[PDB]
Assembly symmetry: D2
Homo-oligomer: 303 residues x 4
C-alpha cells in the first residue's frame, strides 16, 4: 500500500517492525524520488520520503498521474516538497514534527565525551594495536562549568545528563523552564556564558536573530581550549570564524552534526568530529519516527 | 629521576613541581640514577631484587606488583586515581560504542556520511548495572543517573549478580581484582545477560573470561564490549563492536595532576602511605 | 540510451566518449529491476552492469517499454537470460575484454603495496606517525615469481614482473609464444607452488580451476609466500587461506573482489580502461 | 651494544651476526653513554663530542650528519602504484567493508611516458622496472649511464622531460644545481595530473611550491619518503602518500646493511 524512498536499512528495519501493528503493504526503494522515478509508485496510495527526495511540482503531478494520494515524511523538515502545489493537487502531506529529545541530547554528549577523550583517535590506534597514549589526554568534567544554549526538551535532557557529571550548569534561553530550574541550572547572558563555560552545547532553533550566533566575536570571549558541540542547525556556528579559532587555538575541540574537504582538513588536523545528522539514530528514535509516520498514514484513511 | 616517561607524564610533573621545587630528571626508558635520592617508576619499570645511593622509590600508580619488598629503601605510591575521571572515561567508551562514533570518524574524516550500521540505543529507558560500589562505581553511578537509566549495582538498588545480569542492558565493572573476582564474568554470566548487552570494563582484565567473551560476541550475546587494556585486538575490533583503549582511564589533566601531586608530596614527606 | 548502476566513472567516461557518438544519455544511479524498468520508456537502448537484472521479466518489461537493445559494459553476461532475450527479439551486446595491461598493473601495485606495507604506512603517516616497525618488505629482484594463466593479462603481468628482475615460471595447459619469448619457463603447479615466492593468478574460472588454491596447494607453497588474485575469487579456497594465514604459510594475500588486502573489483578501474569500455560499448550500439 | 634499536634492526643483526659471533631501545645521549661500560648507532642517536668523550670514558647507514639500489627503486614504484591506484585509500575503505570505488580511478602506465631524474644505480633499477610497465623512458643525468642506454632510455632536456612525462621519479643526490630542482617553474611546465615520487633527498622539491601546485591541480599525486600538520592536510585532502624513510626496509637490504656493519 506504501512505497518508501531513499531507503536505508535502518529505515527498512524499523518501518517493518512497526508496520506489524499497522499491517500496511510496504514496498521499499533505495533510490531517490524524482520525476523520472516517480512512476515506481504506481498502485501505491502513499509514498514515504526523506529530505533529499524531490518534491518539486513536477514530481507531484507525476505522482498524481499514478494515483498517489498521500505523501509522508520520515523527518520533520519538509523543505524539499512544494506544499502549495501539493494542495492544488489535493495531495495530503504529512510529517513527524519532533524526534526523541533524549537521543539528540545523548548524542551530543557522546561526541563530547568522544572528543574530550580522543576516543575516536584511540580506536584508530587501537585497532592496529598501537596503544600509545600520547595526545589522548582529556579533561575531567566534574569540576567544570557547562553552558547550554537553549532550554527546549532536548536542551533540558542534555542538562540532566550534564548534571550527572557533577558539572555546574549555566543556560541561556530567554525563558527559563522550571524543569531546568529544579536541576539547578542558572540562566545567564551569553557573554557570561561564553566566558564562564568550558563546555558549550547548542540546542536551539535558528532564527535570523541568532544566525551565526557563535561568531568570532563570540569566540574571543570564550575560554581557551573550550569544547563546543553543536547538534543544532549549522548556521548557529560561523564556520569561517570557527576555523580561525581552532587554528589559533581558542577552541580545543568542536563537535558538529551535519544537517544535509573542509572536513578532511579539519578532522585530520584538529579535534573536530563530524557526524552526518546522526542524532536520532537510535532504535527507539527510529521506532518512534515510524509509529508517527505510519500512524499518520492510518489517520488519512479516516480523519 | 623519572622512568618510562611520556610527554604528559612529563607535563604534569613539571607543573606540579613548581610548588615542590624538586629537581627532575626524565628518562624515556624502562628500569643509571646516580645523584638521585629517589626514583619514579610506572607500571612497567622493574623493581625486583637486582634493582647508586637512591634512598626511596615512588610509584606513579596504584599497583605495586612490579616491585618487591629490606635494603633500607622506602616505597610509596598513589592508591587512588581520580574516581571521576575513570568513571568519566567508562561512560565515554560506552557512548562511543553505543553510537558507533568511533566508526563514524573513520568515515567522516574522509567525508563519508553514510549512517548505515551506526544505529544505537537510547539510554533513557534503560536499566543499568554497576559492579563495585567504590568511589569510582558511585561516580559512574551518578553519571548513569543523569541519563535517566535505572540503576542496579552489586557489592540505587543493590542486587545479586544473576538478578543484575538478566535485568541490566548496560554493564560496567569498577572493582579491584580478587581471587573471588577473577573471571567474574564468564560464560555462565554471558549466557545470563540480555542479548545485545553492552559491557565496559575499565577495571582489570581478569574480570572477564577472554575466550568466554569472544564466544559470546560471535554468539551475539554481547552487543558491544569496551576494554581498557592494562592480533586478537585487530580481529575483535575489526569484526565487532569492540573498543580497546590503552589504560587511558585516568588520562586527564586533572587526574594526572592529582597523581603528580600525590606522588610529589609523598616524596616530600613525616611519613605517608607506603 | 539509459544507463543503470551508473557510478561517476561510468558517467564521466561515457560522456567524454559520447562526444564522438552523439547519443542521448540518461543516467540512473539505481539498479535495473523489474520495477525500475519503466524508467526506460522512450529509450531504444539500455546499458547495464553485472548486478542489474536481465532475468526474463525484466526483459519482458523492457520490451513493453520499447527497448530494442540491451548493452552491457562488462565482459560477463551471467545476469541476462539470453534465450529469452532471443525470444523477445532484443539484441544484446557486450564488451569482450578489459585493458589487459590495466588489470595486470593492478595486481602488481597491489603486490608491492602488500610487500612494502604501504597501506599500513599510510594509516600511520596520515597521522604523522613514522614508526616503521612491522613494515619490512622483501626485495623482488632475484626472486622467483610464478604466474598461473598466461592469457593476455598473464603475459602482461609477466612482463611487469620480468622488469623487476624476477625469475619466471608459469602454468598454463596451453602455453603462449609470447610468454615463451620472454624466457618464462612453463611448469606444473607443484613445481610452481614450491618454487615461487610470489604467485599471481590470471586465469578464468573453470570447473577445473575451482578452489585451485586449496590446502593441498598451500602446504606446498613456500612459507611467507605472497599471493595476489585478481581472477575470480573461487580460485582460492578462502577457508584454507585463513587457516594458512594463521598457520603462517602465507605471507600476504591480495584479492580483487566485489596481512590481507581487499579491493572491490577495481582492476580495470583506470581511465584508459573505462574509456575503452565506453567506446566499445557505444560502438556496439552504433551498429 | 645497540641503540635506537627497532625490531627490524635487531632481527637482522642477530641473523647476520651468527657468522661473526660478536641491544638498547633508547637513544644514545651523553646521559646514556654509561651503558656502554664498539657501539651501534643510527641517525637520530647523539654523536656530540661530549657523548663521544664520555664514550672514550667507557653508524648503520650512509649518513653521518650527527643501500641496495634495487630496494629503494622498488619502493619507489610501489609508492607509485599505490598512489596511482589509490590502494591506500581502498584499504581504509575496504577494511571496514566499504566497497565503493568512487574516487579511486587510476591510469594505465602502459604506453605512458615516464621520466627518471638521476641515473645512479637506483635510477637504473627503477628504469628497468618501469620498462616492464611498457612505459616510454626518458631520463636526465648530466652523465649518461651506459646501462640505461641499453635499456633504451633517451636522455633529455629537463624542460623536455617535464613537459613529456606523465610520471616523474627522482633518484639523484642533492646538489646545488638541483636544490629545489622542482619549483614553481618546473611544475608549471608539467602535464596536469602528473605523478611525482621522491625517494631522494627532500630538498629537491620546493615544498610550498608543490602545495600550491597541488591545490592548483597541476600535480595529480605526490609520493615522498621522509629522511629523518602539513602532513595531515596533504595526506588527508590530497593524493599524497608519505612514508618514513622506508625505502630500504627489506629483509634483503637490511641484511646487507647488517653484514656490512658487522664487517666494518
Amino acid at each position: 500500500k506504501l512505497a518508501v524512498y531513499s531507503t536505508k536499512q535502518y529505515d527498512k528495519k524499523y518501518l517493518q517492525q512497526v508496520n506489524e501493528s499497522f499491517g500496511f503493504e510496504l514496498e521499499f526503494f533505495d533510490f531517490l524520488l524524482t520525476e523520472k522515478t516517480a512512476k515506481t509508485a504506481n498502485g501505491c496510495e502513499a509514498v514515504c520520503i526523506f529530505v533529499n527526495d524531490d518534491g518539486s511540482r513536477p514530481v507531484l503531478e507525476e505522482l498524481k498521474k499514478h494515483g498517489v494520494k498521500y505523501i509522508a515524511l520520515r523527518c520533520a523538515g519538509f523543505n524539499n516538497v512544494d506544499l502549495d502545489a501539493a494542495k492544488e493537487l489535493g495531495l495530503k502531506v504529512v510529517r513527524v514534527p519532533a524526534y526523541d529529545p533524549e537521543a539528540v541530547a545523548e548524542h551530543a554528549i557522546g561526541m563530547m565525551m568522544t572528543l574530550n577523550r580522543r576516543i575516536h583517535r584511540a580506536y584508530q590506534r587501537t585497532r592496529d594495536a598501537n596503544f600509545s597514549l600520547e595526545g589522548l589526554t582529556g579533561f575531567t568534567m566534574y569540576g567544570k562549568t557547562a553552558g547550554v544554549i537553549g532550554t527546549g526538551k532536548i536542551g533540558v535532557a542534555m542538562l540532566r545528563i550534564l548534571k550527572g557529571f557533577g558539572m555546574r550548569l549555566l543556560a541561556f534561553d530567554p525563558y527559563p523552564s522550571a524543569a531546568a530550574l529544579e536541576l539547578g541550572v542558572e540562566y545567564v547572558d551569553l557573554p557570561t556564558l561564553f566566558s564562564e563555560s568550558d563546555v558549550i552545547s547548542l540546542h536551539c532553533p535558528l532564527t535570523p536573530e541568532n544566525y551565526h550566533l557563535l561568531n568570532e566575536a563570540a569566540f574571543d570571549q570564550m575560554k581557551n581550549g573550550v569544547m563546543i558541540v553543536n547538534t543544532s542547525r549549522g548556521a548557529l556556528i560561523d564556520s569561517q570564524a570557527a576555523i580561525e579559532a581552532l587554528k589559533n587555538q581558542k577552541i580545543g575541540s568542536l563537535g558538529m552534526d551535519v544537517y544535509e574537504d573542509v572536513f578532511r582538513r579539519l578532522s585530520a588536523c584538529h579535534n573536530v568530529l563530524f557526524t552526518g545528522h546522526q542524532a536520532f539514530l537510535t532504535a527507539e528514535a527510529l521506532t518512534s519516527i515510524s509509529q508517527t509516520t505510519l500512524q499518520n498514514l492510518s489517520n488519512l484513511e479516516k480523519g
